Amino acid sequence: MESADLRALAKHLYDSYIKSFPLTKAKARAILTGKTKSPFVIYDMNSLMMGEDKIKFKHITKEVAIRIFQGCQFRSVEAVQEITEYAKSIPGFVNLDLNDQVTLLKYGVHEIIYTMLASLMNKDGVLISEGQGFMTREFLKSLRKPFGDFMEPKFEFAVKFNALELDDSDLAIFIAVIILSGDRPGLLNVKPIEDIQDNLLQALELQLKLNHPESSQLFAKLLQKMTDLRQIVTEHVQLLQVIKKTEMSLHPLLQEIYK
Amino acid sequence: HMESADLRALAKHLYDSYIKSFPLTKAKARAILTGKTTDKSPFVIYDMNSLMMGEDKIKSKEVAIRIFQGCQFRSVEAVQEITEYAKSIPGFVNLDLNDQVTLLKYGVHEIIYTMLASLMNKDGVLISEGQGFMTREFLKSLRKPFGDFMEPKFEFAVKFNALELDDSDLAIFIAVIILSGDRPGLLNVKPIEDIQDNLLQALELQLKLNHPESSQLFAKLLQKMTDLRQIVTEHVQLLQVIKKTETDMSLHPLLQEIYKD
Ligand SMILES: CCOC(=O)c1cccc(COc2cc(C(=O)O)ccc2-c2nn(C(=O)c3c(Cl)cccc3C(F)(F)F)c3ccc(Cl)cc23)c1
Ligand SMILES: CCOC(=O)c1cccc(COc2cc(C(=O)O)ccc2-c2nn(C(=O)c3c(Cl)cccc3C(F)(F)F)c3ccc(Cl)cc23)c1
């Protein structure tokens, strides 16, 4: 592809990405750094109870660790729809076989949710409620039984990923590359998916050299993270399934929403 | 950063050392596998009877155990060849000695898988310096847990070999794997990353020059490189589970130490 076509693709994806996701990394970073109403901070039990009285979350119907976990699930379901809408803007995606569209999204959303959650995180906590809240890492890590160990790996990944210092225009292409993975199980027509991903990879490569000219082999470093995400996600799903098997107790309708 | 001439010089150095370090190259393996030559033809082992004839021609335990000891013996040799290759990588021996060990400990299995693919096609694997060829089917039909222990090596190889890398490409790729700064327990990550950045630069240019019509081959090769991470952990887990049931299995101390934590 010609460079002009690659920059057109990068800007097209950036524009759609800004429209698709409520809180961008740039805005999140402004909140986390203090360069912008202070968000309400949840740092222990009492501040959690006050936060759900002030913020009034949508997942509120239980134990504290459960309530937080269910807040995470509720937001992930929201993210899945935001990512699904974003995919439609990826040139060529909507022309793929409908089953392959479903397959790509089915196996991709988890890696993208992990990736984009890093935009909302620093080493000390995570932005919530479209940035109105900030729940500290220590409080999330100290949750009982497997919940503490379920939260901390997200921060562990985010701290390393954020050292790459990607911005939103970088992430918009990177997220598209993840979606267009030709090795997802059960794909019917791999060829056009790789054809698009090859185009996205060229655009990402050019974007990173222009946007980060002093960042050596950042392209290579980002690709390694992308396939790290594979196993991080499979570990996530294992814990996620063990959590439901050991704790759930949900209305079956709720189970289907979260299935 | 490095200038192109320096990057090509690094590529040629690595290829020279690789040829000096690894006795059976992919180029020779493919010459044997492709055939159309009378002098290099392997004896093919495809069942019990041919295994007995092969062990007489090629030169008292269960069959699956005997094959396993053949694999580990050769993996131990591979560790030795990989260790010798690493020392030739500019900067490696200058690193903290603990980090040298750590890099080798976590790197050799990913490299063995990579280089085992050179010896494989979809129907089997070259053995005994290419004098033999054992079919995939025969390996897959081994009893107990051994049959399923063998097949994933072929599964990786068929996909990896689709990239059509040659030895000069592989020499650099193998070097990139060794110089991974994210191995657990490394003491000084920064100088390892500095070397890897030079190796990644060299790999990128090598793949563009050697495979100009291969779209984003650099990116595809990097994706394989981090798949090997889990492919290896599945191997190691299986090997530990197998070892608990099979007493007739003894691991070489070199391998035993590699798998400890
Ligand atoms: C007072 C009540 O507190 C809260 O409501 C609360 C508490 C802490 C954090 C959050 C917000 O969380 C997220 C936001 C976003 C976003 O805004 O883009 C994306 C992801 C998460 C998030 N998912 N998750 C998962 O486990 C997960 C993931 Cl990664 C992928 C797929 C499915 C799931 C899940 F199983 F959950 F379904 C997290 C684990 C830890 C943390 Cl810290 C955040 C997340 C809200
Ligand atoms: C009757 C006589 O038969 C034989 O002598 C015999 C039979 C079959 C295959 C082989 C050759 O095998 C290898 C050769 C090389 C090489 O030449 O570079 C590298 C690797 C292998 C090889 N390791 N392996 C492992 O399991 C393994 C691995 Cl990957 C890494 C570390 C430790 C081990 C192990 F546990 F073994 F300790 C294989 C599994 C399947 C296959 Cl197909 C090949 C290999 C020789």
Curated annotation (Swiss-Prot), chain B:
Residue ranges of the region described as Interaction with FAM120B: 3-48
UniProt record, GO biological process: BMP signaling pathway; cell differentiation; cell fate commitment; cell maturation; cellular response to hypoxia; cellular response to insulin stimulus; cellular response to low-density lipoprotein particle stimulus; epithelial cell differentiation
Q: Which residues bind rosiglitazone?
A: 72-75, 109, 235, 259
Q: How is its activity regulated?
A: PDPK1 activates its transcriptional activity independently of its kinase activity.
Q: What is known of its domains?
A: The 9aaTAD motif is a transactivation domain present in a large number of yeast and animal transcription factors.
Q: Where in the cell is it found?
A: Nucleus; Cytoplasm
Membrane-spanning residues: none
**Tissues of expression:** Highest expression in adipose tissue. Lower in skeletal muscle, spleen, heart and liver. Also detectable in placenta, lung and ovary.
Concerning PTM, the database record says:
Phosphorylated in basal conditions and dephosphorylated when treated with the ligand. May be dephosphorylated by PPP5C. Ubiquitinated by E3 ubiquitin-protein ligase complex containing FBXO9; leading to proteasomal degradation. Ubiquitinated at Lys-20 by TRIM55 leading to proteasomal degradation. Ubiquitinated by E3 ubiquitin-protein ligase STUB1/CHIP; leading to proteasomal degradation.
Q: Which disease is it linked to?
A: Defects in PPARG can lead to type 2 insulin-resistant diabetes and hyptertension. PPARG mutations may be associated with colon cancer.
Which conditions up-regulate this protein? (Microbial infection) Expression increases when incubated with M.tuberculosis or its lipoprotein LpqH; induction is TLR2-dependent (at protein level).
Q: Where is this cross-link: Glycyl lysine isopeptide (Lys-Gly) (interchain with G-Cter in ubiquitin)?
A: 20
For this UniProt record, the keywords arranged alphabetically read as follows: Activator, Biological rhythms, Cytoplasm, Diabetes mellitus, Disease variant, DNA-binding, Glycoprotein, Isopeptide bond, Metal-binding, Nucleus, Obesity, Phosphoprotein, Receptor, Transcription, Transcription regulation, Ubl conjugation, Zinc, Zinc-finger
Subunit annotation? Interacts with FOXO1 (acetylated form). Heterodimer with other nuclear receptors, such as RXRA. The heterodimer with the retinoic acid receptor RXRA is called adipocyte-specific transcription factor ARF6. Interacts with NCOA6 coactivator, leading to a strong increase in transcription of target genes. Interacts with coactivator PPARBP, leading to a mild increase in transcription of target genes. Interacts with NOCA7 in a ligand-inducible manner. Interacts with NCOA1 and NCOA2 LXXLL motifs. Interacts with ASXL1, ASXL2, DNTTIP2, FAM120B, MAP2K1/MEK1, NR0B2, PDPK1, PRDM16, PRMT2 and TGFB1I1.
**What Gene Ontology terms describe what this protein does at the molecular function level?**
alpha-actinin binding; arachidonate binding; chromatin binding; DNA binding; DNA binding domain binding; DNA-binding transcription activator activity, RNA polymerase II-specific; DNA-binding transcription factor activity; DNA-binding transcription factor activity, RNA polymerase II-specific
Q: Which family does it belong to?
A: Belongs to the nuclear hormone receptor family. NR1 subfamily.
Chain ranges for the short sequence motif 9aaTAD as given in the UniProt record: 253-261
Q: What is the lineage of its organism?
A: Eukaryota, Metazoa, Chordata, Craniata, Vertebrata
The listed outcome for residue 72 to P is: In colon cancer; sporadic; somatic mutation; loss of ligand-binding
Gene that produces this protein: PPARG
Residues shown, of full length? 235 to 503 of 505
Cellular component per GO, a single term: nucleoplasm
Q: What does this protein do?
A: Nuclear receptor that binds peroxisome proliferators such as hypolipidemic drugs and fatty acids. Once activated by a ligand, the nuclear receptor binds to DNA specific PPAR response elements (PPRE) and modulates the transcription of its target genes, such as acyl-CoA oxidase. It therefore controls the peroxisomal beta-oxidation pathway of fatty acids. Key regulator of adipocyte differentiation and glucose homeostasis. ARF6 acts as a key regulator of the tissue-specific adipocyte P2 (aP2) enhancer. (Microbial infection) Upon treatment with M.tuberculosis or its lipoprotein LpqH, phosphorylation of MAPK p38 and IL-6 production are modulated, probably via this protein.
> Where's it mainly located?
nucleus
- NR LBD domain span: 6-261
Protein name in UniProt = Peroxisome proliferator-activated receptor gamma
